[PDB]
Design a binder for this molecule. Structure first.
Ligand code: HEM
Length: 384
């Protein structure tokens, strides 16, 4: 019988998947919000198949929305494209996201992070880590990536904070997104006049990308990279405070990978894809026109892949099989930047405040249960 997309986390188990997801067989029929009866995939093996197989399309016309569709993806909005279209954009951006090119940003990521930790030390405790650190820091990292001027930091942060914060209406969000989008078009127009060696400057120089395509690429980087990162930083801090034996393990080489696996913040039927043909999948028959959604949090706890899947274990040997970054052609472009932001962010936070603790009971922390990026709405913390 078709299940609805599981949304309910067990009280007192904020980091673990909904029990109604973990309970399911590998491939389940799913009733979508519009009535479509598609599929939800929960095994690591079957998920991998969906992510790498070309008979699954990410074009939005073919797809039934996962919660809450017409329209070709705007030029440059390459997440929602298939090869060969996807490939053209992806090939030009590769260069900008290696270990090597991201390394150039590290010193500024460091300073941004320390700046924010300085502001927390200066205000003294208690502080909401979400607004003081987890939201702002990754937004200012994107400002650097995109080469936003310093005079425009306050504006960029304001709109980006609105989009990502609790107690904001849908109209407020939409309004902020339009301000941000207009600002990016203007930023791209300025850089066209005098291109530098930032991501956008390099692209204007080395490629035939139009203003429109650059605008959409910059926006996509913002939208895919802000809330994701912010929420790993916030929920990850939560997890570390609730499992503090792990803090001493934070320098382990795969510690950020284990946090990515355990938390699986891209948590609600994403990635999802439209079948372009009939496809057989773990003995089920997906038909042409069916939407297939992946339940990453369960993929990342698959007992055929990971030992003791439900324990947070920063020095685990098998963290790197996780799919927290997706898979296939759309596998996260910003993966290397995220990793560095998280490493730098978790490490400096705990070095500065070895005494950090939650400033309210754990039961009081509010969770982003229906949001595309799972996390906490607020994280009051204190220190000595
Ligand atoms: C600097 C931060 C980041 C940037 C700039 C960024 C950028 C992007 C972009 C452009 C894509 C689409 C790639 C394509 O279609 O070829 C993408 C995909 C994806 N990213 Fe990231 N990302 C960032 C951080 C994160 C974080 C922290 C996570 C999760 C922990 C995440 C998870 C994903 C996943 C699951 C996809 C695949 C979505 C799908 O297949 O439908 N990303 N990212």
């Amino acid at each position: 019988e078709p299940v609805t997309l599981p949304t309910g986390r067990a009280v007192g188990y904020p980091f673990d998947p909904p029990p109604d997801l973990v309970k399911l067989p590998p491939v389940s029929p799913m009733r979508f919000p519009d009535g479509h009866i598609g599929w939800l995939v929960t095994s690591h093996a079957a998920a991998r198949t969906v992510m790498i197989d070309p008979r699954f399309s990410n074009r939005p016309e073919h797809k039934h929305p996962v919660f809450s569709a017409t329209k070709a993806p705007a030029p440059g909005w390459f997440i929602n494209m298939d090869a060969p279209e996807h490939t053209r954009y992806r090939r030009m951006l590769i260069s900008q996201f290696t270990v090597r090119r991201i390394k150039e940003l590290e010193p500024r990521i460091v300073q941004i992070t320390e700046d924010h930790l300085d502001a927390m030390a200066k205000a003294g405790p208690p502080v909401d880590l979400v607004q003081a650190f987890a939201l702002p820091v990754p937004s200012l990292v994107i400002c650097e990536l995109l080469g936003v001027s310093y005079a425009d930091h306050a504006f960029f942060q304001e709109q980006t904070t609105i989009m990502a914060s609790v107690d904001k209406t849908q109209d407020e969000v939409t309004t902020a997104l339009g301000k941000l989008t207009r600002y990016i078009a203007e930023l791209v127009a300025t850089k066209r006049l005098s291109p530098k060696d930032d991501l956008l400057g390099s692209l204007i120089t080395d490629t035939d990308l139009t203003d429109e395509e650059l605008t959409n690429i910059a926006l996509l980087l913002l939208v895919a990279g802000h809330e994701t990162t912010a929420n790993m930083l916030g929920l990850g801090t939560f997890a570390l405070l609730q499992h503090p034996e792990q803090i001493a393990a934070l320098d382990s080489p795969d510690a950020v990978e284990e946090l990515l696996r355990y938390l699986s913040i891209v948590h609600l039927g994403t990635p999802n894809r439209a079948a372009l043909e009939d496809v057989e999948l773990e003995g089920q028959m997906i038909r042409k026109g069916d939407t297939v959604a992946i339940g990453l949090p369960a993929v990342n706890r698959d007992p055929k892949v990971f030992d003791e899947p439900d324990i947070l274990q920063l020095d685990r040997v098998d963290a790197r099989k996780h799919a927290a970054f997706g898979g296939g052609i759309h596998q996260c472009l910003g993966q290397q930047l995220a990793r560095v932001e998280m490493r730098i962010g978790f490490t400096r936070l705990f070095a500065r405040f070895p005494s950090l603790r939650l400033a309210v009971p754990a039961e009081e922390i509010k969770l982003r249960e229906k949001s595309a990026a799972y996390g906490v709405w607020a994280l009051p913390v204190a220190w000595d």
